[PDB]
């Protein structure tokens, strides 16, 4: 790989028409986090609100003037928005002269900026920077993260896979005093694949463990679906470098993750041969709001 | 819709810091707070410097000079301080009826004990501090058994006069 | 855990609608104790 | 279609050798290469002999004769040196800005360190080598922790006076 | 409608606590604050831990960890916190302008005075503090001649390496 807008060709030679675009991971945010843009572009906080009350009952009698009360409270909490951006560059010598081989320089790189915009958002979704303290999905610190059930799915029967796969369900049922139900599960994708490809360990009819689509405790309890699916940063996430597996409830009022404004462009500033060009942003970093919602699974 | 602060309880709590607990007899006296930061809810008060003033600081009360009372929780004051009586507000206080209050001993309370003030810093116990510190509350007694920093209810009268103890 | 009924709302922030109650786990009684209410009530 | 040194990387890469970062301060000054061969992108360059001219041997700089600057990635070089600025050509020296150069020192660099420029190769570094061999670019800091032989971002001055050190 | 700290002045006033004033060249710089508490307007800033943050404690540097730069007036910060920048937010450091500071020192600054930094407290003054406790700023000089606690506008350079004075 060079830099020089130009290569030596010849007469006898034919140069193909397409350019081959080196490839990067998709971008697998939309639809797993709730995201909205519904704030007006230039806000600073976002805050929100709640209530509570308390009181006891007790035993009585015989025309006493004790009898007890009640009470109520209220209360509010805040998260913040941050501003960012990205933009391009040129000489005078690099576009005037990238013309003379039909290449558009200044148009190539508007749309590599936005990609590099959507893997950015991506990034602060999903992990952490430790510069503004954003805690991601895959390492929040709040929730908790408990070890499978001597569970390495690999050299494992299916009566195994089937327990270990339970147990995160049942763990989040048990977590938050029997209330909630774990709608979505994400895991490594090499064990979506050990697990969408091992037969049920059966001689009789070979069906795939992905009978645990309809026999999972959710979808037993009730008839809604569960939705499982395969990511890509989870391999290495566990507390000794182990691959680690998520549970939650994907709901607006569990996750969110504010983006106020999307990315635009601004004018064009030019000095002594060069134009430089900027480009700005601002999002808000993911929010989780019910820690115990939220489930770790470890050493799958 | 905030989840904040959830903490999916077995059931409801018992009481908030200075919340009181019904029944037909109650002393509550209208004083006006004089100290520059406010007072807390579950709070004892000292006699002021204004003839109906209270202070929070109760670092010199002697059987002389008893404490006046015990602030209570009025949920209506002026959201700016977050649960406090603001500096010049009226300040409620309670000196007959039974009260909410918050716990500092190593091993609880139970049902009738004495209580004792710490003048250092104004918390309630169960027996002596042991350095000419602490003063009982002569007519005073608990009414719940409960642990460390905890919410326990007590029933309090504040005619009677306190005693020293070194 | 504020209890003054009041909230301050700045100029450059946004307020979410709806408040969230705390959850209490379900009742469970009714349906698998039978009650009755025939008695006179003193 | 070439997929030849695919690696298939997890994200973007940070920069190229001698890319800078867009700041509104840039003194960019033009000088020509006197070098047989061509000079590298992000390089530190010394004063030529031709009143404007420029050598990439700086064997010889001293706080008496400080280096001139460091070049710029160009794209437009002449096709026929990979990534140079050929003999007699435009070389945009830098010489204000925030510039991409490349580690040399064992132990990497973090946010905030001196920047030490070894004279037998033209190096730059954290510490000085030790032998009379090394310059330190008084006016200089580095703006990204990196690791050996990778890319850093460091922020340069060169009216600054260049300190000797043995 | 609101009269509350009128004191019918003669004239205008000058400035601000950290209000620029205009010219061509001028380095802004965005860190991220650090420090619990917010950092004022027109104040000295360290470099941070965190690579690319900054803070309000300039107790410990030196000519080997020379300060960062100045922060400037932005007047849309948070509302929460008075006239600062609240933690975690962009800091807008200058290190090249020209601004407005607040003077610190018994007899004042005339026009062209050395600049010294009090490493105890982070203030400007004219002559040394005399106990090892003090820096020079190399490249700064004042531009306004003003009295005890008033505003004078200084021009800054950081790039250029401070000097320690004992």
């Known amino acids: 790989m060079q830099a020089n807008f130009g290569f030596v060709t010849s007469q006898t030679a034919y140069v193909e028409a397409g350019v081959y675009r080196m490839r990067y991971p998709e971008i697998r945010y939309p639809g797993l986090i709730p995201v909205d843009y519904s704030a007006p572009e230039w806000i600073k906080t976002v805050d929100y609100y709640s209530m509570d009350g308390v ?10 003037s004790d009898i007890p009360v009640v009470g109520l409270a209220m209360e509010k909490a805040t998260t913040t928005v941050h501003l960012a951006g ?57 929730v908790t993260a408990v070890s499978a059930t001597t569970g390495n799915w690999a050299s494992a029967t299916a009566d195994q896979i089937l327990a270990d796969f339970n147990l995160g369900i049942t763990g989040l049922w048990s977590a938050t005093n029997e209330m909630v139900y774990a709608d979505t599960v994400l895991l490594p994708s090499a064990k979506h694949q050990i697990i969408a490809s091992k037969r049920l360990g059966n001689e009789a009819t070979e069906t ?18 569960l939705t499982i699916r395969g990511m890509r940063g989870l391999n290495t996430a566990g507390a000794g470098g182990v691959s680690r597996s998520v549970f939650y409830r994907n709901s607006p009022e569990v996750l969110k993750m504010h983006i106020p404004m999307r990315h635009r462009f601004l004018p064009v500033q030019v ?18 709001r019910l820690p115990k919602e939220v489930r770790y699974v470890d050493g799958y | 819709m905030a989840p904040y602060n959830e903490t999916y309880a077995s ?66 004051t002026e959201n700016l301080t977050l649960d406090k009586y603001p500096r010049y507000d009226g300040a409620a206080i309670m000196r007959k009826g039974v009260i909410w209050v918050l ?13 004792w003030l710490k ?36 029933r309090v009268d504040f005619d009677v006069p306190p005693v020293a103890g070194a």
């Open chain 2, 103 to 115: 716990v500092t001993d190593a091993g609880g309370v139970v049902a009738g004990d004495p209580v």
């Open chain 1, 271 to 288: 000095v002594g041969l060069t134009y430089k060009v900027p480009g700005i942003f601002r999002l808000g970093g993911l929010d989780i």
């Open chain 1, 208 to 225: 795939v463990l992905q009978f645990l689509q309809r026999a999972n405790v959710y979808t037993a309890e009730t008839g809604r679906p």
């Open chain 2, 119 to 154: 003048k250092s810093d104004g918390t309630f116990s169960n027996a002596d501090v042991g350095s000419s510190g602490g003063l009982r509350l002569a007519g005073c007694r608990w009414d719940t058994s409960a642990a460390n920093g905890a919410l326990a209810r007590m």
């Open chain 1, 55 to 64: 009181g006891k009952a007790e035993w009585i009698a015989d025309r006493a």
């Open chain 2, 11 to 76: 059931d409801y709590a018992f009481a908030y810091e200075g919340m009181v607990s019904d029944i037909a007899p109650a002393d509550i006296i209208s004083r006006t707070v004089e100290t520059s930061a406010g007072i807390g809810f579950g709070k004892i008060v000292a006699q002021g410097t204004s003839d109906r003033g209270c202070k929070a600081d109760v670092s010199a009360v002697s059987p002389t000079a008893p404490p006046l009372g015990i602030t209570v929780r009025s949920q209506a």
């Open chain 1, 86 to 142: 990205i933009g391009y560059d040129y000489g005078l010598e690099e576009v005037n002269q990238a013309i003379m081989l039909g290449m558009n320089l200044p148009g190539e790189k508007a749309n590599l900026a936005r990609l590099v915009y959507e893997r950015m958002v991506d990034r602060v979704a999903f992990t952490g920077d430790a510069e503004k303290d954003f805690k991601g999905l895959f390492n929040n610190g709040a």
